[PDB]
């Protein structure tokens, strides 16, 4: 019955502890020798980039590289540090150095890939998203990489999922959907017939429990769930 498994957003693959490290080390490289706290610069930057990026939700996609540069450009002015080019390429380097994938990702992707179409969906730019997956070492494990830039709209928008399924050549009813935030993923409260799996690593997402077919704290359960559905 099931022919494709999709992972939406990097929260289903990267841990909060690993993500925060890459982010911390990201600002470290940006500041260099300039006397600024990387912890605080991340706080203001993450706050500002969220504001700017949220204004495009479900609307025609503007690449994040241009929204990041503007946010970073303003911070450089505010605090008086040089802007060392695009942050996107710095992130790929930090992911290379420190990683941050959940311990079982590569194992789970490897098993599913032998039986089903394993695709990933991201609310990011196509080029950088692929480079980031390569840095983590899981790019070649996916049968398809679908992004908001390719679909033309930011999260949420049906064209993203529609295109992901088009790549796999399967209908939604024959696909599984792994996400970590139902109100911040590609399909929003929409799936196209897909069987949803909510990743709650800590069991602290009660508000999202009732809007997901299955719940798991370990991605290896995605193997069993998909297996039983067949």
């Amino acid at each position: 019955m099931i022919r494709a498994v999709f992972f939406d957003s990097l929260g289903t693959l990267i841990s909060v502890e690993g993500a925060y490290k890459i982010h911390v080390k990201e600002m470290e490289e940006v500041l260099g020798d300039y006397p600024l706290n990387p912890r605080t610069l991340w706080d203001e930057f993450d706050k500002l980039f969220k504001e700017a990026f949220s204004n495009y939700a479900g609307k025609p996609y503007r690449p994040a590289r241009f929204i990041l540069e503007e946010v970073m450009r303003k911070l450089a002015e505010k605090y008086g540090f040089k802007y060392p080019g695009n942050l996107q390429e710095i992130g790929v380097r930090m992911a290379r150095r420190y990683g941050g994938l959940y311990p079982e990702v590569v194992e789970v992707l490897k098993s599913l890939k032998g039986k089903y179409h394993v695709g990933v969906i991201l609310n990011w730019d196509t080029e950088n998203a692929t480079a980031f997956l390569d840095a983590l070492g899981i790019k070649d494990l996916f049968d398809s990489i679908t992004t908001s830039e390719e679909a033309g709209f930011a999260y949420p928008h049906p064209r993203i999922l529609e295109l992901a399924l088009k790549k796999a050549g399967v209908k939604g009813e024959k696909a599984v959907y792994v996400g970590d935030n139902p109100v911040k993923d590609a399909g929003g409260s929409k799936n196209l017939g897909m069987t949803s799996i909510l990743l709650d690593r800590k069991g602290e997402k009660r508000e999202f429990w009732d809007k997901a077919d299955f719940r798991v704290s370990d991605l290896r359960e995605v193997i069993k769930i998909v297996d039983e559905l067949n």
Side-chain angles (χ1 to χ4, degrees):
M1 159 189 303
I2 299 297
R3 291 169 100 51
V5 180
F6 289 107
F7 293 75
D8 192 329
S9 300
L10 272 180
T12 63
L13 305 161
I14 268 172
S15 63
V16 55
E17 315 102 53
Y20 190 70
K21 192 217 238 284
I22 281 163
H23 291 150
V24 152
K25 287 335 198 172
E26 257 167 46
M27 313 279 80
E28 209 187 88
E29 170 137 308
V30 171
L31 293 173
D33 307 298
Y34 281 96
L36 217 78
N37 190 333
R39 157 164 37 76
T40 76
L41 181 81
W42 173 249
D43 286 355
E44 191 154 46
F45 168 83
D46 193 55
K47 156 189 107 145
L48 296 164
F49 176 72
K50 267 206 262 283
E51 279 179 0
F53 199 62
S54 72
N55 291 333
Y56 301 82
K59 295 188 249 172
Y61 188 76
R62 166 169 204 223
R65 49 173 169 275
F66 303 126
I67 310 183
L68 294 158
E69 156 161 29
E70 293 180 344
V71 174
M72 271 299 317
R73 272 206 210 157
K74 288 190 64 262
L75 292 171
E77 270 226 6
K78 187 185 189 250
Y79 297 110
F81 61 88
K82 197 174 154 223
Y83 168 72
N86 192 359
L87 176 64
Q88 282 186 350
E89 262 92 356
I90 292 164
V92 174
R93 287 205 287 285
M94 299 306 105
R96 259 191 237 139
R97 186 153 254 201
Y98 305 106
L101 277 176
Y102 287 116
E104 76 275 22
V105 178
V106 181
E107 189 200 337
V108 170
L109 300 171
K110 263 167 154 284
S111 33
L112 290 167
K113 190 203 71 143
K115 281 294 118 203
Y116 320 103
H117 181 101
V118 182
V120 60
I121 316 187
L122 304 99
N123 197 30
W124 207 245
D125 306 337
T126 307
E127 259 211 2
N128 188 230
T130 303
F132 206 87
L133 293 175
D134 219 0
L136 302 163
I138 58 168
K139 177 205 109 85
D140 292 303
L141 294 172
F142 295 104
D143 290 285
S144 69
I145 291 154
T146 311
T147 55
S148 294
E149 201 190 2
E150 172 174 37
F153 298 86
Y155 278 24
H157 201 280
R159 263 210 71 160
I160 299 173
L161 286 186
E162 136 183 351
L163 175 67
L165 282 164
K166 212 193 78 163
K167 303 230 193 91
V170 308
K171 303 175 278 290
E173 71 221 65
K174 307 204 121 67
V176 168
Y177 186 81
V178 179
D180 73 329
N181 193 336
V183 317
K184 302 246 208 93
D185 55 349
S189 295
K190 205 166 138 179
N191 42 48
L192 308 173
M194 287 201 261
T195 309
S196 32
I197 300 172
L198 180 270
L199 183 68
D200 190 354
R201 262 259 172 180
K202 254 94 154 183
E204 261 157 321
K205 293 178 184 165
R206 284 161 119 221
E207 63 200 274
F208 299 136
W209 286 2
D210 264 4
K211 39 170 56 172
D213 292 309
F214 299 92
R215 207 217 321 168
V216 309
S217 69
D218 188 296
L219 280 173
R220 289 179 289 234
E221 198 168 345
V222 167
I223 303 173
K224 179 54 146 67
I225 291 160
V226 174
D227 222 56
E228 218 45 51
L229 278 165
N230 282 25

